[PDB]
Amino acid sequence: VGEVLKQLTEEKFIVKATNGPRYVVGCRRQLDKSKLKPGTRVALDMTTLTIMRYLP
Amino acid sequence: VLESTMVCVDNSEYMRNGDFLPTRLQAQQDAVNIVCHSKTRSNPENNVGLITLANDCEVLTTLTPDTGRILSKLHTVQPKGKITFCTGIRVAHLALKHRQGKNHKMRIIAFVGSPVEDNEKDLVKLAKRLKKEKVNVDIINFGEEEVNTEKLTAFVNTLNGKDGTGSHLVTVPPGPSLADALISSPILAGE
Amino acid sequence: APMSLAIHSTTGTRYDLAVPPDETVEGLRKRLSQRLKVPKERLALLHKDTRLSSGKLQEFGVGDGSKLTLVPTVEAGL
Amino acid sequence: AVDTAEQVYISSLALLKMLKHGRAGVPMEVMGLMLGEFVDDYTVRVIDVFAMPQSGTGVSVEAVDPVFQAKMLDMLKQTGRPEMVVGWYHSHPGFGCWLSGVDINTQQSFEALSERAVAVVVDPIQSVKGKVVIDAFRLINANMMVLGHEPRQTTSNLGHLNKPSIQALIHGLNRHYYSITINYRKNELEQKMLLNLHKKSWMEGLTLQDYSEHCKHNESVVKEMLELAKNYNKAVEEEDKMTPEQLAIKNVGKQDPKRHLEEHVDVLMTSNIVQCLAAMLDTVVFK
Amino acid sequence: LNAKVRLLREELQLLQEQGSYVGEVVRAMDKKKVLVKVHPEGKFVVDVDKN
Amino acid sequence: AVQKVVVHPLVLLSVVDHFNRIGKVGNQKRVVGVLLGSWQKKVLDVSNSFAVPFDEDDKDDSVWFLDHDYLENMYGMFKKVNARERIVGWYHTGPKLHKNDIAINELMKRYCPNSVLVIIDVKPKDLGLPTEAYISVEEVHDDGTPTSKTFEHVTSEIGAEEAEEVGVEHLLRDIKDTTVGTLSQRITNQVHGLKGLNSKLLDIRSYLEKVATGKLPINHQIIYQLQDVFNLLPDVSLQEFVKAFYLKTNDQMVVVYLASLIRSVVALHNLINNKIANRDAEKKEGQ
Amino acid sequence: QFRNKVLRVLVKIYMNLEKPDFINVCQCLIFLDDPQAVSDILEKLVKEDNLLMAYQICFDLYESASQQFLSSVIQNLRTPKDQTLKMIKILSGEMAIELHLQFLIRNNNTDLMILKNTKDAVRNSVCHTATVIANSFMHCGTTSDQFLRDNLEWLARATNWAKFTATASLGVIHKGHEKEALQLMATYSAYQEGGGLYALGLIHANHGGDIIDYLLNQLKNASNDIVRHGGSLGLGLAAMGTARQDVYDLLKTNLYQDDAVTGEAAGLALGLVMLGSKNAQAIEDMVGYAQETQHEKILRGLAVGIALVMYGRMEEADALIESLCRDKDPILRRSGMYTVAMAYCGSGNNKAIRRLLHVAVSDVNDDVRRAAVESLGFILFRTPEQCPSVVSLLSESYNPHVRYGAAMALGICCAGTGNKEAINLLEPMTNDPVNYVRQGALIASALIMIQQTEITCPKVNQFRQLYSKVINDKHDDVMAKFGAILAQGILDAGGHNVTISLQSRTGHTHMPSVVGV
Amino acid sequence: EFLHAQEEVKRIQSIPLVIGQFLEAVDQNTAIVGSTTGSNYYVRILSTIDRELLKPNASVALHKHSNALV
């Protein structure tokens, strides 16, 4: 679980994972990039850390 | 036998006729039903397809071993226009060509009760083409027992050559539904 | 009458076998898994859009040479 | 015994479909099958690749519809490609080109079916706007490893294979699976097509850029040039004087005058010169 | 130019290697060992190379 | 009214490959298939396709076997594979359009209310894109014959998002020619545009010659358009146009002149630096 | 044309001498073709009874001129009888190779201890074949075989495409031993059978006895891809240059029997047979089969075949060369570059070098870039001092295949010459961060230092020790050891009694040498 | 070739990477970077970074493992 920080270009986002490190990752297509926005939480994947599902 | 059967059906404005009880269109429906059932009782994998002959000689169903879709689609038909033939036969031959099962023998059957406005020379040339393309044709004529029976006899003789028995003609005079003739017809009697 | 069968393989090896008139789907899957030295669990059978999984094959109507294709169960990941 | 010089010529169509599928499937280790052919003992021709509707879990994938696949096979035989299965491919978005345990098992199955099957791996995450991160693979026989036999006789220098990747080594490269060389062959139609893809239309080819926008563009460029000249003069005011050699590039990590000057002067060359040429050429060619 | 581009190719090729930590020297002793702090983590001793 | 259509490299290569199939299979000279894309806005994105067994006789032109049952089967099949793909058009590999096309387009429109036909020229050219986009519109012939079902041209071009770009440009780099050299590339664009214009006017001249000889009937509409073109031709020796032309060319040359000064001064600076550095170095080797 | 005119004038001047130097006369005649002139001169010398002069002329002719020229002269002479027979035999070269055979036999200085070291260092089948080849090189045409008759188990350790190379090495070792041919091979599966055919061909390399007919019969009666490939290679070697329609026909049939294994050998053998003879018929046939057949292996075979077929015709190559160089396939572009090499061998044609460098630098396929630079190497051999500059600027390249090609070009340039600058430039290359590049550096250095000593070239020790170290190293690559092993085989090839020069001692290009290299 | 190769480096510039702050650039091809992981590493920078945006204490990607600035 980590909250996105910036809509970097289109398929790139800076997300600060709750554990502390900050990453840049791309998101699965079926996520309506408009939905997620600075401050929204998301569930990145173990291995690749692509944004899988945004959360309230 | 493995059989891929194309079937053309006339729907000319004459098929508005009702000389055959109950009416010509319903006689065609009966004929298609009986033929489809006969083919199904034949090798089940045998495949079937349908064409309607009109001003534009349209195609209804491509090859398929089913008969439910066949009959269902054929129901939603009304007689209109005049048979264009020639083009219909060519389309049916292309259909048989583009058949998934190549092993299946290629057989066309045409319900052609109508007057045929065709040149017999081109009929003969088409006969040559089709025989060289190795497809056997069976005609079911009703109505014009005189207008086109000679033409169709010549066409069938052409297809047969000296031994091409696979070609068949069945012309039925005025009378009841086109069921008894088909069932007691050589084309299905051989079956 | 050990009816034969047409076990097609999407890879191509069209090996086949004959079994008694009544045979089990899982028994046949065992036969093929043995013949291929591969586990049964990762084999899937087909019969005209039908994924044969359990039965005597007459529950599905399999006759002589009924054209059963063996699509391998492909699963990637880690 | 298999050969080292074995090649896989993948159709451009196949490559495009593989890459598009995987890029769609990130992060899912999406999977697809391909139809090719085994022309001989040294070559495998890959024609087309079609995906699998299955959408499993974010760490794994699974075959769903063997009926789906059999029907695809029959129909493509009817029209399309009368090839028939030769391997399978799946994306590994950000891992390299190695085969997981399940990957290896799927393969083992594939070879069991057809001893010379192939696996394929693609990294749409890594495949760059240029070179493309892909590879082919075939397992290594544990019987051979224990008996001391070797994977392939290398009757060639086509065994360099471009420095097998350290990551692949780690994940098991050359100890259970060995890389194979990919290639691209075009029967000239797709080739000149590819050529056509980028080519643009004479619409623009002759369409002179609007001139008001161009004048303003020149205005802005000359202004930024003036400022760059000012800072360049300041920079040269010392340059070598006061000896920044020790400073070297680390004199300042920002705002090099010369590089910006040359970049913008070049771009305004391009713009102004070509627009003037188009003006001349049109004025004279439409009469 | 050829040297530039070779440098670039190699740079891509072997940037996979990990970098290095920055440590604050605290004390020194025999050439064999020297003390140093590795921020943020604790203070240790290191076996210096031949520089 | 679908003003704008973008085809995609994947569909392009797929059509090419299928045409190659058919060429090997026999001699059909043309082939047909279906075109899947998401009709985003009034701008179609033809982003995938698949062939359909088609045929016709060279003589009658009313005979063909487009298989609507196959069509529906695999349209649903690809819908299953992926969702955002509902038919939008159809492609044919015909060097020129055919009469058959209107009837076939009506058939396809039976599935797509606004279907788009596209001609893909497997045979190469050097003037424009290898694709053309047409739509079956009906227009009233203001005079004489009634309205007819005739095809109409729509702005067709080509694009790719990122992944298709990577794949295509990779294969290109593998077998291609020099990339954008800026000046070189855009001058090549100028000359290519001139070549295209010349070829088009060659075509129109040939048609005019055929009409003048009487090989075909006069089309007052095509005439209308031609004399509209000529009426639209400009005047260069207008003595106002020329003054403006000289004035703005003077401005263009002024900016280019200053930019040339920039280039010269920087090069001279480089020469001074290199000379002094080399002198100091050789002095060092002297001592 | 002007060169030929001046040659004719000089020949006439020579003839206009108290004791005309028929040596120079026949040399210039060879440069002028004209077998009739030399035949008539020789017959006149026969009448003069100048037996020694005729012997010397015949030996020079055999050394320099081409098989077609010698055959024309042979038939013209056939048009006392003992002296005529001696002339005929000498011109055919029979016993003119037995001399060299006995020469090596009586001088076969070979330090097999170094190869014992190597075979101790050998682990992989790669280096196994490497050492097989190196031993074949060492022995060269010697009837004495040590490893093959001693390390029988070690030989057995190699199989697959190793038995073939082993039998080929056997052929190389017993090179030229025509006397027991068809009985020597009584000593030595499909691989070994094909290798036997190939080795028989090598034994009859450029010497087309009835073995050409025998190989034709066998290759026709070949029932395996491997057997067909080996027999194709052997027959092509036997009939190299001597374009014979029956042989070309059998090769065409085997080639049309589409198969990578057989196809590669078919292409090579076609090029060999029709070498320098440039039949447009066969040219079009090969080009078409190449452009239509989908087997990159056969495609390489046809590449070499089309390059070879048209060795002569120095300038009469522009059409085909331009076609190939503008062709589609990279392999066919490579074919074109090799064809340019074969056409312009030793000409130093600046147009040819323009083409070759431009393509080697601008093409998009590294394989063809490498091939093009190697072609440059072939072309510039008559002017060894020239090549170093270009091959240097190249060798220090971006593309490791470009660097490798530069190395091999230097090797061709200085083959048998032992240049100093060439080695000065090779040493930095070897020990490079790539495998094949180092392999090529090693092979080129060995080629240059062939039959050289320390005093003549004060780096042979450095490079011999480098070979020994690399062979007895761990972290070098398998192919690096392969290159080192071949480098040793080169340096100490043939009892350390043989060298490699493209042009005969008469300053005359040697077609067999060029094709072999 | 150089313009071709300038692009391959983006391969190292993959998606799943880390962020940090530029602290100091040493000679030509290396810098100190305080990664968000909490530690600061000396590592050899990538080329084609323009060496101009690396202003003191500026955000910079770092490759996930190598940690070299990308």
Beta bridge partners of D91: D122
What the block records as the tokens of G111 is: 């330090």
CA G29, CA G38: separation in Å to the nearest integer?
7
Radius of gyration over every alpha carbon of chain F, rounded to an integer in angstroms: 27
D59 shares contact with chain A (CB less than 8 Å): yes
Residue found under tokens 């196959």: F70
The phi, psi pair for B138, rounded to 5°, reads -130, 125
**CB-CB: which of C36, C50, C77 is closest to D113?**
C36
Give me the residue label for tokens 């020694």. G52
With CA atoms as reference, the chain D residue closest to A50 would be D27
Radius of gyration of chain D (CA): 28
Q: Bridge partners of D60?
A: C77, D57
Query: For G450-505, what is the HEC assignment?
Result: CCCCCCCCCCHHHHHHHHHHHHCCCCCCHHHHHHHHHHHHHHCCHHHCCCCCCEEC
Query: What backbone phi and psi angles, to 5 degrees, belong to H69?
Result: -55, 140
* Residue D25 in contact with partner chain A when CB distance is under 8 A: no
Is the Cα dihedral F63, F69, F70, F75 positive or negative? positive
Map out the domains of chain F as residue ranges. Answer: 2-182, 223-282
Partner-chain contact E12 H8, CB within 8 Å: yes
Residues of G in contact with D154 (CB under 8 A): 126, 478-479
CA–CA separation, G293 and G302 (whole Å): 10
β-strand B47-53 against C17-18: which pairing, if any? unpaired
Q: Which residues of F touch H4 (CB under 8 A)?
A: 173, 179
Chain B interface test: which of D73, D74, D76, D78 (most B C-beta within 10 Å)? D78
User: Taking the alpha carbons of D68, D71, D77, D82 in that order, is the dihedral positive or negative?
Assistant: positive
Residue D152 near residue D1, CB atoms below 8 Å: yes
Q: How far is CA G266 from CA F183, G190, G203, in A?
A: 49, 18, 19
DSSP state of D42: S
Placement of tokens 């009757």 in the chain: D155
What contacts G106, CB < 8 A, 6 or more positions away?
none
Give me B78's structure tokens.
């009304």
Contacts for G283 with CB less than 8 Å, ≥ 6 apart? G306, G309, G310, G320
> Which of A22, A45, A49, A50 would best serve as a mutation to test chain H binding (most H beta carbons within 10 A)?
A22
How far is the C-alpha of C53 from the C-alpha of C64, rounded, in Å? 19
Q: Are H25 and H31 spatial neighbours (Cβ–Cβ below 8 Å)? A: yes
Report the candidate in G288, G284, G199, G211 with the shortest Cα–Cα distance to residue G242: G211
Q: For residue G302, give the DSSP letter.
A: H
Best mutation target, G326, G327, G358, G364, to test chain F (most F CBs within 10 A): G364
- Are the C-beta atoms of residues G295 and G498 closer than 8 Å to each other? no
Q: F30: alpha, beta or left, given left = phi > 0 and alpha = psi -120 to 50?
A: beta
Pairing of strands A41-44, A51-55: antiparallel
Rg (CA), chain H: 12
Query: Across the interface, which of E12, E15, E22 has its CB nearest the CB of H32?
Result: E22
Contacts by G22-30, CB closer than 8 A, 24 or more apart: G22/G53, G22/G57, G23/G56, G23/G57, G23/G60, G26/G57, G26/G60, G26/G61, G27/G60, G27/G64, G27/G506, G27/G508, G30/G61, G30/G64, G30/G65, G30/G69, G30/G508
- Counting one residue from F and one from H, how many pairs have CB atoms under 8 Å apart? 3
Resolution of this PDB entry, in A?
Answer: 3.9
The CA distance from G396 to G53, in Å, is 51
- DSSP codes of every residue in F154-216: -EEEE---SHHHHHHHHHHHHS------THHHHHHHHHHHHHHHHHHHHHHHHHHHHHHHTSS
Q: Subunits that touch chain B (at least 3 Cβ pairs < 8 angstroms)?
A: D, F
Chain position carrying tokens 């050359």 = D174
Cis check: omega of the bond before G20, within 30 degrees of 0: no
Residue of chain H whose alpha carbon sits nearest to that of F181: H3
Q: How far is the C-alpha of D232 from the C-alpha of F270, rounded, in Å?
A: 13
**Chain H closest-CA separation from residue A18 CA (Å):** 12
**Residue C27 burial class via C-beta count within 10 angstroms: exposed 0-12, middle 13-18, buried 19 and up:** middle
Task: Flag if A45 and D95 touch (Cβ within 8 Å).
Answer: no
CA atoms within 13 A of residue G56's CA, in its CB half-sphere:
11
Cβ contact H27–D248 (<8 Å) = yes
Chains with 3 or more CB pairs under 8 A to chain D: A, B, C, F, G, H
Q: Note which residues in 148-187 of chain F have CB less than 8 A from chain D.
A: 157-158, 162-177, 182-183, 186-187
Does A31 reach chain D within 8 Å, measured CB to CB? Answer: no
What DSSP state is assigned to residue G176? Answer: T
| Contact yes or no for F63 and B62 at CB 8 A | no
Between the CA of residue B135 and those of F25, F64, G380, what are the distances in Å? 20, 18, 69
Enter the tokens of residue G256.
């049309």
Residues on chain D touching H55 (C-beta within 8 angstroms): 253-254
Measure in Å the smallest separation between the Cα of H26 and chain D Cα atoms.
Answer: 7
Q: Indicate the helix (H) or strand (E) that contains D24.
A: helix D12-25
Residues G191, G196, G201, G202, CA torsion sign: positive
Gap between the Cα atoms of B88 and B94, Å rounded: 10
| Cβ pair E19:H65 closer than 8 A | no
Length of chain D: 287
**Of D2, D70, D58, nearest in space to D33 by CA:** D70
Q: What residues of chain D lie within 8 A of the CB of F170, using their CB?
A: 15, 127, 130-132
Other chains touching H, judged by 3 or more CB pairs under 8 Å: A, D, E, F
Method: cryo-EM
Q: At what angle do helices G51-64 and G22-31 cross, to 10 degrees?
A: 30
CA distance G122 to chain D (A): 15
Sign of CA dihedral G490, G494, G499, G501: negative
Strands B136-142 and B168-172: parallel
DSSP element (H, E) containing F70: helix F68-81
SS3 G75: helix
Q: Which residues of D touch H8 (CB under 8 A)?
A: 128, 130-131
**Helix or strand (DSSP H, E) at G322:** helix G318-325
Selection from F184, A3, G12 nearest residue G4 by Cα? G12
Asked if the peptide bond before residue D27 counts as cis, ω within 30 degrees of 0, the response is yes
Which residues have CB under 8 Å from A9's CB, separation 6+?
Answer: none
Minimal C-alpha gap between E5 and chain G (Å): 7
Q: Where are the beta strands (DSSP E) in chain D?
A: 7-10, 31-37, 43-51, 84-91, 118-122, 134-139, 177-183
CB contact (8 A) between residue H7 and residue D255: no
- The answer to whether the beta carbons of residues G343 and G515 sit under 8 Å apart is no
Other CB atoms within a 10 A radius of the CB of residue G37 amount to: 20
Angle CA(D51)–CA(D55)–CA(D60) in degrees, nearest 5? 100
- Secondary structure of chain B in HEC code, one letter for each residue: CCEEEEEEEECCHHHHCCCCCCCHHHHHHHHHHHHHHHHHHCCCCCEEEEEEECCCCCEEEEEECCCHHHHHHHHCCCCCCCCCCCHHHHHHHHHHHCCCCCCCEEEEEEECCCCCCCCHHHHHHHHHHHHHCCCEEEEEEECCCCCCHHHHHHHHHHHHCCCCCCCEEEEECCCCCCCHHHHCCHHHHCC
Question: Comparing C-alpha atoms, which of D44, D16, D45, D46 is closest to residue D132?
Answer: D16
By CA distance, what is B84's nearest residue in F?
F62
- Integer Cα distance of F239 and F231 in angstroms: 20
Report how far residue G430's alpha carbon sits from residue H43's, in angstroms, rounded to the nearest whole number.
31
| Residue from F71, F21, F75 nearest F48 by CA | F75
For F151, phi then psi, to 5°, come to -80, 150
Residue D227 φ then ψ, to 5°: -65, -45
Which two three-digit tokens encode residue B7?
């079937």
Of G506, G509, G514, G397, which Cα lies nearest the Cα of G26? Answer: G506
Angle at D211 between CA D205 and CA D213, to 5 degrees: 105
Task: Kindly list the residues from chain F whose CB atom is less than 8 angstroms away from the CB atom of residue D78.
Answer: 53, 70
CA nearest to D29 within chain A: A48
d(CA F249, CA F243): 10
DSSP G247: H
- Residue D182 pairs in a beta bridge with D8
If one counts every other C-beta atom within 10 angstroms of the C-beta of residue F143, the result is 7
Contacts of residue C13 in chain D, CB cutoff 8 Å? Answer: 113-114
State the residue for tokens 């670039």: E8
Can you give the C-alpha Rg of chain A in angstroms?
10
Name the H helices within G181-244: 190-203, 211-220, 225-238
Q: Which residues of B touch F62 (CB under 8 A)?
A: 56-57, 87
Q: Where are the alpha helices (DSSP H) in F90-160?
A: 100-109
Whether H contacts A, i.e. 3 or more CB pairs less than 8 A apart, is yes
Q: How many CB pairs under 8 A join F and G?
A: 4
**Residue A23 and residue H37: Cβ atoms within 8 Å?**
no
Distance CA E2, CA E20 (A): 29
Chain-chain contact of G260 with D43 (C-beta, under 8 angstroms): yes
SS3 D124: coil
Q: What is the CA angle B165-B169-B173, rounded to 5?
A: 155
Number of other residues whose CB lies within 10 A of the CB of residue G280: 10
Binding-site residues of D for Zn(2+), please? 90, 92, 103
Phi, psi (degrees; rounded to nearest 5) at C69: -100, 140
Give just the sign of the alpha carbon dihedral B23, B25, B27, B30: negative
Helix (H, G, I), strand (E, B) or coil at C25: helix
- For chain H, positions 17-56, list CB contacts with chain A under 8 A: 17-19, 36-38
> Which strand (E) or helix (H) includes residue F249?
helix F241-286
Return the ∠ at Cα B99 (arms to F71 and D79), rounded to 5°. 55
Cα(F64)–Cα(D257) distance, integer angstroms? 69
Residue D185 φ/ψ, nearest 5 degrees: -120, 135
From CA D31, how far away is CA D18, in angstroms rounded? 9
Q: Is residue F199 less than 8 Å (CB to CB) from chain B?
A: no
**Two tokens at D163?**
């420095």
Q: What is the CA radius of gyration of chain C?
A: 12
G126 three-state secondary structure:
helix
Instruction: Tell me the shortest Cα–Cα distance from G327 to chain F, in angstroms.
Output: 12
Q: Give all strands of the β-sheet with F116-120 in edge-to-edge order.
A: F148-153, F131-139, F116-120, F86-92, F32-37, F43-51, F4-7, F155-158
Binding site feature residues of D: 90, 92, 103
Report the alpha-carbon distance of residue C78 to residue C63 in Å, rounded.
Answer: 40
What is residue G392's three-state secondary structure?
A: helix
Helix, strand, or coil here: D46?
Answer: strand
Is A24 in contact with H38 (Cβ distance < 8 A)?
no
Q: Cβ D66–C45 below 8 Å, yes or no?
A: yes
